[PDB]
Every structure is written in C-alpha cells, then in structure tokens.
Amino acid sequence: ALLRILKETEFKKIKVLGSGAFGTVYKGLWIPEGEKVKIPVAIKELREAKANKEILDEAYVMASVDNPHVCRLLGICLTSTVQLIMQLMPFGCLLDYVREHKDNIGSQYLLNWCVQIAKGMNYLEDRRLVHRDLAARNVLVKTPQHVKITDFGLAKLLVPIKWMALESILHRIYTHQSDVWSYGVTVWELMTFGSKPYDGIPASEISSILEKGERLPQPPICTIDVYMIMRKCWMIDADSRPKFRELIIEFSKMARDPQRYLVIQGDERMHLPSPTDSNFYRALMDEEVDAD
Ligand SMILES: CSc1nc(-c2cccc(NC(=O)c3c(F)ccc(O)c3CN3C(=O)c4ccccc4C3=O)c2)c(-c2ccnc(NC(C)=O)c2)[nH]1
C-alpha cells in the first residue's frame, strides 16, 4: 500500500526543474480521477539503465523508507519511461540553497543540517541501503529547518569522483563506510556555502592526490573541531572512519554551542526561527537541536 501505480493519464509534466546524471526532474500535476483539483508533484524521469517487474520491486523498497530525513518514493509509472513521483519541494536542493544564502546562514542552521543528514544516513545504514551518491545536490530542502536525503540506490540500479572514497574510485567498492567519505565532502560543501570541491583539478587526478595525502582545505568558518571530523571521514582505512551514529552525536553536541564551533560574521543575528515563525512554517509546509 505504500506505492501508487499511476496511469499516464492522471498526471502531467509541466516544467523541467533540473537534469542530472540519472534523469530529468519536472514540476508536475496530479489530477485525481473524478475530481477537479490539480495537485503539484515532482516527477523524475530516469534515463535508460531491467524488466518492469524488477523495477517495481526496487520501487517498493524506495517507497518503504520511513524517516523524517529520507525522501520516500510515492508513485511510479512504467508505461514508457520510468517515471517516479514524490512530493514537490519548492525550496529545491540544499546545494542551491546554501549558494543562494552564501554568507547569510547562521551556525545553528549549518550544524543542524549536518545532524539531519547524518540521521537519514544512519537510517539508510539500518535498512542496509548504500547511497553511492550522497552530495549536497542530493539533499532536498523541505523547509530551511528540515532537509531530506534523496536518490539512494539510484547510482547502483542505473560518476561523482570528487565525492567518492578512494576504494570506490580504485575498486568500485561501495559500502556504508564509503558513504561516510561522501558525507564528509557534503559537510565541506555546506561549510563553504556550496564551493565546488577540487575546483579546476581533473577527476582523473583525484585518486593520485588522495594517495599523496592531500585533502579538501579547511573552510574559513570551521574551527579545527569541525575540520577534524571531515578529515576523519576521508581516512584511507574505511574502518577508521566515523560511523553515522557517531556523527549524529558529535554534530548534535556542537549544535548546542554553535558559535564555539563555527566562526561566522553576524552569526548572533542569524539564529533559528522564533517559535512563532517555526509554527507558521510547519503548519503551511511541514505538518509531518538548539543552543543552551
Ligand atoms: C537529484 S535532483 C532531484 N530529484 C528530485 C526527485 C523528484 C521525484 C522523485 C525523486 N526520488 C525518488 O523517488 C527516490 C526516493 F524518494 C528515495 C530513493 C531513490 O533511489 C529514489 C529514486 N529512485 C531510483 O533510483 C529507482 C530505481 C528503480 C525503481 C524505483 C526508483 C526510485 O524511486 C527525486 C528532485 C526534487 C523532488 C521534489 N521537489 C523538488 N523541487 C525543486 C524546486 O527542485 C525537486 N530533485
């Protein structure tokens, strides 16, 4: 009951919202049968990678996740292309969000996003779902206070070298501990307000600079405590890397004293919303950690 099979005649693509390595995302409308309302949805049309039944079996898995920081597949249509339906998130992905708010994001937001991403990843680890492509472009913003991971398993069932653990580059090994590497790069993206990692360095060179011990640089706003977390995510020995549940704890601890761990100009005037604005955001958009 968690996956709705849609017929092509009950939804329509309206405008393209983006494209990626795996398909095209549309703003769409769902038109309930026998009703006169048009409900906005998001539609992902995949590129060609599988029998329809095997695709449906993978879809039931994507539809069965249940965690506030992980997107769930809601509906699917397999008549022509593979078309995936989920709730429309008007804020888009977190990478675009942080670039758009470049030096106007407080430390409380940044650290809470790190907590939320670690929580969704930890849940995927519990379900034995390896993401393979965690990055700020695959974290969706439901509200600025609530982010959600999408597209786990998409990489497998269908190449982000600059987000991949060394063992994934050299040997195509993909585990939860290689997702931890990508988590560290995702944290780096957030802390640099969406900088491109290893900008200007060709992808084919990343393996060699990693083996020489070079890593992404310390973001200007990060205290060493935050930067050490990222460095630990990029250890060559995958079993030396942090676990997602250890990352939740560490980033949650930091979120309780955020201005001690990130150094942001004007941070004092960039706190989380008052209870009034939070209640308003939740009532309108989100009916489903603070300083001490
Ligand atoms: C990266 S860009 C991007 N994508 C999307 C998008 C749109 C619709 C659906 C999805 N994803 C899933 O349904 C899904 C998921 F929920 C969890 C895991 C997962 O693996 C998948 C994918 N997946 C597969 O690989 C796959 C293979 C075989 C069978 C079945 C499946 C299968 O379902 C994503 C957006 C987006 C979404 C909502 N609002 C906006 N708003 C603005 C302003 O942009 C953007 N942005």
Residues of the chain with CATH 3.30.200.20: 4-87
Cα torsion 225, 68, 148, 87 to 10°: value is: -170
Instruction: Using alpha carbons, select from 152, 150, 151, 148 the residue that is nearest to residue 129.
Output: 152
Residues with CB under 6 A from ligand 1: 17-18, 20, 25, 42-44, 55, 58-59, 62, 71-73, 84, 86, 88-90, 92-93, 137-138, 140, 150-154, 157
CATH 3.40.50.2300 fits 92-284, yes or no: no
Instruction: Give residue 84 CA to ligand 1 midpoint distance, Å.
Output: 7
Q: Contact at 8 Å (CB) between 112 and 145?
A: yes
Residue 174: other Cβ atoms inside 10 A: 18
* Cα-to-chain-centroid distance, residue 247: 16
d(CA 25, ligand 1 centre) in Å: 8
In a 3-state reduction of DSSP, which class is residue 233? Answer: helix
Element (H, E) at 75: strand 75-77
Which CATH superfamily does the domain covering 4-87 fall into?
Phosphorylase Kinase; domain 1 (3.30.200.20)
Give the H/E segment covering residue 52: helix 52-62
Asked whether the beta carbons of 162 and 185 are under 8 A apart, the reply is yes
Answer whether 150's CB lies under 8 Å from 140's CB.
Answer: yes
| 201 vs 180: CA distance, rounded Å | 22
Amino acid at 100: E
Q: What is the DSSP letter of 146?
A: E
Question: What are φ and ψ of residue 222, in 5° steps?
Answer: -85, 125
What is the resolution of the experimental data for this entry, in Å?
A: 1.8
CA distance 84 to 96: 22
- How far is it, in rounded angstroms, from Cα 184 to Cα 200? 20
Experimental method: X-ray
- Report d(CA 57, CA 95) in Å as an integer: 31
Distance 234 CA to ligand 1 centre (A): 27
Residue 34, token pair as written in the block? 């026998």
The single-letter DSSP state of residue 220 is T
Q: Give the pair of three-digit tokens for residue 40.
A: 């906005």
CB-based contact 105:95 (threshold 8 Å):
no
Neighbouring-strand partners of residue 83: 45, 77
User: Helix axis angle, 244-255 relative to 176-191, nearest 10°?
Assistant: 30
Cα–Cα dist 36/83, whole Å = 23
* Region(s) of the chain under CATH 1.10.510.10: 92-284
